[PDB]
Design a protein around this ligand. Sequence first.
Ligand SMILES: Nc1nc2c(ncn2[C@@H]2O[C@H](COP(=O)(O)OP(=O)(O)OP(=O)(O)O)[C@@H](O)[C@H]2O)c(=O)[nH]1
Ligand SMILES: Nc1nc2c(ncn2[C@@H]2O[C@H](COP(=O)(O)OP(=O)(O)O)[C@@H](O)[C@H]2O)c(=O)[nH]1
Ligand SMILES: [Mg+2]
Lengths: 430, 45, 426, 182, 52, 26, 218
Amino acid sequence: MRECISIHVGQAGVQIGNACWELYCLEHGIQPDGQMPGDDSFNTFFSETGAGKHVPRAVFVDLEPTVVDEVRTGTYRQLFHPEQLITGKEDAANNYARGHYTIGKEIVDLVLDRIRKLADLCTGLQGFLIFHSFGGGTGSGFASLLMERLSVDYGKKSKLEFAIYPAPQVSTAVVEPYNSILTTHTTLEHSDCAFMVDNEAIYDICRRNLDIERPTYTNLNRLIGQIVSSITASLRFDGALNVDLTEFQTNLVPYPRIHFPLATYAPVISAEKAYHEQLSVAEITNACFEPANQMVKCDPRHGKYMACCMLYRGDVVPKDVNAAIATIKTKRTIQFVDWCPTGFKVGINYQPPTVVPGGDLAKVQRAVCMLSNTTAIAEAWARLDHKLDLMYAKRAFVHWYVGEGMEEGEFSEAREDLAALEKDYEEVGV
Amino acid sequence: EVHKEFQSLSVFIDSIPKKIRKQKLEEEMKQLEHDIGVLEKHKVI
Amino acid sequence: MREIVHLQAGQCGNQIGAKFWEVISDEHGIDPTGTYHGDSDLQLERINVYYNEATGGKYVPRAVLVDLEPGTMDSVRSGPFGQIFRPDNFVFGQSGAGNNWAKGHYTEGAELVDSVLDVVRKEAESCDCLQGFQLTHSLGGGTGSGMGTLLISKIREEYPDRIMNTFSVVPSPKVSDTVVEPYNATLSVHQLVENTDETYCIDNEALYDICFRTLKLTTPTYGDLNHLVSATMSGVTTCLRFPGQLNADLRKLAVNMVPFPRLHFFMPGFAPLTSRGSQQYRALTVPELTQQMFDAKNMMAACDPRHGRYLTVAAVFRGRMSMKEVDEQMLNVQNKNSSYFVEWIPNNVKTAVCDIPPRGLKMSATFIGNSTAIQELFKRISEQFTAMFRRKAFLHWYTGEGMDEMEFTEAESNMNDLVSEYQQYQ
Amino acid sequence: MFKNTFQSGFLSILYSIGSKPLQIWDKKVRNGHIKRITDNDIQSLVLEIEGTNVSTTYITCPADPKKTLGIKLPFLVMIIKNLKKYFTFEVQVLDDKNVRRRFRASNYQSTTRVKPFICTMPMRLDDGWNQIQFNLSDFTRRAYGTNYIETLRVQIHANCRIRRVYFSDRLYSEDELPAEFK
Amino acid sequence: LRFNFYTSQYSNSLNPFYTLQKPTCGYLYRRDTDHTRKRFDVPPANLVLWRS
Amino acid sequence: ETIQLITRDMVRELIIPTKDPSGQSL
Amino acid sequence: VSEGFTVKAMMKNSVVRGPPSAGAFKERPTKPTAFRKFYERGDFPIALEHDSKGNKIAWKVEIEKLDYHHYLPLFFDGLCEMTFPYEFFARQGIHDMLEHGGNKILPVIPQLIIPIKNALNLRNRQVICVTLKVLQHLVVSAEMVGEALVPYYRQILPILNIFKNKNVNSGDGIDYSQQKRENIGDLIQETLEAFERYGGEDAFINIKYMVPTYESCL
Ligand SMILES: Nc1nc2c(ncn2[C@@H]2O[C@H](COP(=O)(O)OP(=O)(O)OP(=O)(O)O)[C@@H](O)[C@H]2O)c(=O)[nH]1
Ligand SMILES: Nc1nc2c(ncn2[C@@H]2O[C@H](COP(=O)(O)OP(=O)(O)O)[C@@H](O)[C@H]2O)c(=O)[nH]1
Ligand SMILES: [Mg+2]
């Protein structure tokens, strides 16, 4: 009765879900057909029928039928229900207004039915998990409609977002400084928390800490599956200090305007660096604080930590946990804010992290995931604001938005909203 | 015989083989202590 | 005769009650299936103080298990001694508070409190002559620190004359377990004072220090700390269950230990602490016992006592023991360091002697102590409150359930005054 | 039984608060039940006894049929909730003439026959809770020429809600009575 | 006249002080132990049906 | 065996420990 | 053994068998109802919000201006399901439309006897206690309802005669499940008290003819 419903938007979201539900099927042993060869660990991700068939509690939504057809004709085509995955006809194609006003308008009524028909099967469902991208049209425009409609019509429950932030140096599209500004302005009052990831940082993680060239997006989706498994491990498996889905927002966001921490998975070690490196706790929780080992390209040296949420797995002896957090407090190089003197939250699971075949991570026995909100994340918004200032000065792609029902004043509204969010971010860390 | 070894351990235990050695010695001594104290409680078996 | 009602709220209280009822079932010889299987007759004469009688000779633990989420009583049912607990004594919701005082004290913990009050009043009148209540919970959480304190405020109005002592969990000095404990802990301790007459303050770092320095255990879990807590919880209520030459119930330890109603904050210890490698080199004598409680490293509250000064000190003992020597040892520990006790009370030490030791032991003692150095727990929690309230850090999570702003100012003024009133006796 | 007891201003036998209320009482039940309930009128436990036949199920005050309890106290007070149902209770008293005589109070009676073994009398009751008062000396003085020396047994039948059956030396008003006897 | 069979199950001590806990730490880990969440036996507090 | 202590209000039965060891047998 | 009234039974030492059984006190097999069919197609204007203090049903239309001749007789038929969501939705729909059913429950009373009995004719104890609770709610939440049910006493009371002598002989054990009102016979007693209380002077002669061991209250 500790269910959760994951919402995946776009071909970033559905490609994350394709490899994340593989880890979900492997940690519980769910067959790709959808059978289990009394256990109550899969109830937070699977439901039961009279015939023993497990139907996942998720929705994969997109506005083109291309990438979802790979799932529908791939391996797990008998695990998902046909109407549980929602397709459109033509995608928004890197446009916020097209996917937010005209072609995102008809699809929301074909997704709200799925959420309402799925939430009725859950008794004690904890909240919502969102995976979408700023850099596209469906995951930025259609997801913003979903956030607005839920936050007006679903209640005071939780909505955590694992949004794919644009990388600072490299980018795929070119007009995404518009859609990222517009989505951030839309959801900064209709949300509670949102973890950030970018793909260049995970690229240099997979090149540096792991031992392969040339990773694909499938080599990046596995680490997202690992962090989402370490987040929701406590509802599935036993532990000494269980962490429910309600106290990530209660512990990480102090203020309504700031709700953006970072993310870091600690034992990113291949099976070569596994047989040589020591097997204790303290040296892997000393790696979450290295800026090179981060899932967002930023340095916390110029910033300050507001709060942290460390979740452990495996043979974590709580004395080593205590000594490691104490030695973390001893370092001058990690400085904090005046008004959060405690700063840490510890949750411990009794389950070691499982191993996915076809993966590249070693068979490790301890795992740390650390989520900290840091004032240094304001420089990412600052450089994106500088990008929008360079773009809107020459009125670059404005005609692509007004032609389907977006006003001219929404640019000024979003720009002033993020200027206020910046102003709040520098007035927090003093 | 097991407790003879336990008093010959290091006086400052830091490494991982020393830790696991202390754990197996403690497990052996405790299995034997439970077996001895269970039998010593009475006379008829 | 003098039955004890046991309360647990939150997952910390649930784990503590899982281990506390692992020791009382051991000493009263209770099977995991609920049947007496011991080898003596002293364990059955006063069994009613913890176990009601069920049809078939079954002994069920008289206790209330309270929570707001199903994530931790699956562990207490899957535990080794989880079959003796009665199904109806479990009261729990589905979505918890989540490190929140406002929810679990006004909105979530206030709608379900009528069920817990009903269960308590239905059970408590099944005692022949109720002695009092006992609650184990954590101030740093939201389930216990809101809901159990609501029960504290409600049962005290229900029965306005019964004993209410609590085994609370105060925070660690350096390591945190929750970012917001300078809110929940202070808001629970503001309400704790006006209802309770005895508060045992336990913290996890002091127990880690005990399990490392004084014990040579290298890999201790939280259960190894719950056992050390349960040792003191069994030591306090010793004389109720077993006879002796000098008895003391909880009213005895209440009258003797607080001069004023606002000075009901205490900090415990436990006497025999020898490692496995130090078994054969040490003799279980009364001086080697009585040395340990007046040492800082054997204490369950992370507060050094030579900063402070003992006001009232209690000690219960076990086993058929000599008496001239124990009084000589307390007089010696009272007359050597005369600067560690106040001079306006000549006899600060309470002595109670039982005759049944804990199993596997022969001589043991349980120390309950009020002092001045317990202020260091509250001064820093007030400075943390001032460091957090001056920026209005997490205030939006609390005003969203129907709270107020002047209530926090009133709580901080009352706690600063409680701070100031203890300091005059230094 | 109760021969070496003081028999004070009040002597209590049954009480719904405690561990074992029906320790000295016999549990005879045929097509009925015995159970204890938290009441919604006084917010406390009350013994509950009801069955489809009013004479089959009851409770008798000494458990052993040959053993009798001895109460020299003259007055009998019992707190019962009136469920507007068939409720009877009966006492057994001794005289200076050493004859055990019985008094029966029946809810479904309107008449009064007096006879040398049992004197049946009618009974009326109010809406809910009540303090029914019984002077055993008066009942053995008007119906019978003798007087009262020792109460022997008291019986409570079904369709009733018992709390605090007790004996008293004299009529206690609401002021002098302690709060635990209301 | 009293049987009390063997348990092979250590039941908490203080002088040797071994605490009865499922293994979750060094040496005794046994990675294929079952640390999963199980089924309960008591429903939650559905107060909507309890009074109706 | 048990001895009955009948007082006012409260009725209590109390058990008497016996001196037999009587042994056990695993 | 002996079948029965035969000359094999004429033996001085014979063992005869009893009658096989009767379906009383045994659970009758369920049937698919209209509630799931009307719910999975998306007809009801409800959506569960999972509130922390206990679940509550959410109405996206104004409840006081709904058709009680179409929803209520079919919400009542939803009680006969016991899977998980449908029993909750039907029970709370009946409760939240009886609460706001000012002068709209009177004409629909002849349209809801059949679902009430059909839910009551299944010998499941949880559904019987739930139906008894909603039947207690039905007579109170308006005026003129109690004496409108008087000519329908001869077709809802036969199943109210079965479990009335079901209770607990716990001796001196206080019922820890008095919160959860699952003792069926006690519920039948209060429900018959409610039927006597509202229904006029013709009530008692109608519970008496159906239930023969009732006793006149009031
Ligand atoms: N890490 C990761 N990023 C992805 C993946 N798929 C797409 N992206 C990112 O998504 C961004 C573009 O937005 P998309 O999610 O692809 O497209 P969309 O949001 O659905 O909008 P449309 O293109 O209109 O359908 C690019 O910057 C990609 O880096 C993926 O599988 N893994
Ligand atoms: N001694 C002890 N403390 C515990 C145990 N479990 C949890 N705690 C403490 O409980 C605190 C956190 O409680 P929390 O989970 O927030 O309570 P909640 O309101 O029920 O969620 C931490 O500071 C822990 O130190 C235990 O088994 N033993
Ligand atoms: Mg797309």
